Amino acid sequence: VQIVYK
Amino acid sequence: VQIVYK
Amino acid sequence: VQIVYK
Amino acid sequence: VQIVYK
Amino acid sequence: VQIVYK
Amino acid sequence: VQIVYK
Ligand SMILES: O=S(=O)(O)c1cc(S(=O)(=O)O)c2c(/N=N/c3ccccc3)c(O)ccc2c1
Ligand SMILES: O=S(=O)(O)c1cc(S(=O)(=O)O)c2c(/N=N/c3ccccc3)c(O)ccc2c1
Ligand SMILES: O=S(=O)(O)c1cc(S(=O)(=O)O)c2c(/N=N/c3ccccc3)c(O)ccc2c1
Ligand SMILES: O=S(=O)(O)c1cc(S(=O)(=O)O)c2c(/N=N/c3ccccc3)c(O)ccc2c1
Ligand SMILES: [Zn+2]
Ligand SMILES: [Zn+2]
Ligand SMILES: [Zn+2]
Ligand SMILES: [Zn+2]
Ligand SMILES: [Zn+2]
Ligand SMILES: [Zn+2]
Ligand SMILES: [Zn+2]
Ligand SMILES: [Zn+2]
Ligand SMILES: [Zn+2]
Ligand SMILES: [Zn+2]
Ligand SMILES: [Zn+2]
Ligand SMILES: [Zn+2]
């Protein structure tokens, strides 16, 4: 699982 | 699973 | 599963 | 976003 | 974001 | 973010 907030 | 907020 | 918000 | 594997 | 593996 | 492996 990868989660990214930019 | 990959989730990305840009 | 890939989810992308741009 | 909700993802569920059962 | 909620991810669940069961 | 909540991730759960069961
Ligand atoms: O957390 S980071 O900002 O460091 C970050 C951000 C991304 S990314 O913005 O999702 O691009 C990636 C990444 N991207 N993978 C996609 C490929 C195609 C579509 C969408 C995403 C990847 O392959 C490897 C590492 C990454 C690290
Ligand atoms: O999260 S990211 O912004 O880093 C991101 C965004 C996309 S994308 O905007 O969905 O293009 C992709 C991607 N695209 N795959 C499509 C191919 C045809 C139609 C629609 C989408 C891909 O093949 C690999 C990594 C990606 C990483
Ligand atoms: O991760 S859990 O297993 O704990 C899980 C699993 C589900 S569920 O299997 O998607 O049912 C739900 C859920 N369901 N929402 C639907 C309503 C109508 C159709 C499809 C789904 C809900 O409203 C609230 C919490 C949930 C927690
Ligand atoms: O890490 S724990 O195992 O302790 C765990 C596991 C879950 S759960 O399996 O995702 O059910 C939950 C939870 N569930 N939330 C859903 C609601 C509807 C659908 C899917 C999920 C919740 O509302 C609060 C705390 C939880 C703690
Ligand atoms: Zn990046
Ligand atoms: Zn930003
Ligand atoms: Zn990117
Ligand atoms: Zn932005
Ligand atoms: Zn992209
Ligand atoms: Zn935008
Ligand atoms: Zn459930
Ligand atoms: Zn099962
Ligand atoms: Zn549960
Ligand atoms: Zn199981
Ligand atoms: Zn639980
Ligand atoms: Zn188990």
Residue numbers in the entry:
A (entry chain A), B (entry chain A), C (entry chain A), D (entry chain A), E (entry chain A), F (entry chain A): 1 to 6
Paper text:
Here we report the first atomic structures of small molecules bound to amyloid. These are of the dye orange-G, the natural compound curcumin, and the Alzheimer's diagnostic compound DDNP bound to amyloid-like segments of tau and amyloid-β. Negatively charged orange-G wedges into a specific binding site between two sheets of the fiber, combining apolar binding with electrostatic interactions, whereas uncharged compounds slide along the cavity. The amyloid components in our structures are steric zippers formed by stacks of six-residue segments from Alzheimer-related proteins.
We previously determined the crystal structure of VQIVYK in two crystal forms; both show the common steric zipper motif of amyloid fiber-like structures. Co-crystallization of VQIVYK with orange-G resulted in deep orange crystals. Determination of the structure revealed a new crystal form of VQIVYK. Similar to Form-1, the steric zipper shows a tight and dry interface; yet there is a large void between pairs of steric zipper, in contrast to the tightly packed structure of Form-1. Orange-G is situated within this void, binding between lysine side chains facing each other from two parallel pairs of zippers, forming an electrostatic network that also involves zinc cations. As in its complex with KLVFFA, orange-G lies with its long axis parallel to the fiber axis. In the complex with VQIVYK, the aromatic rings of orange-G are also packed against apolar side chains, but the binding is largely mediated via polar interactions with glutamine and lysine side-chains at the edges of two steric zippers.
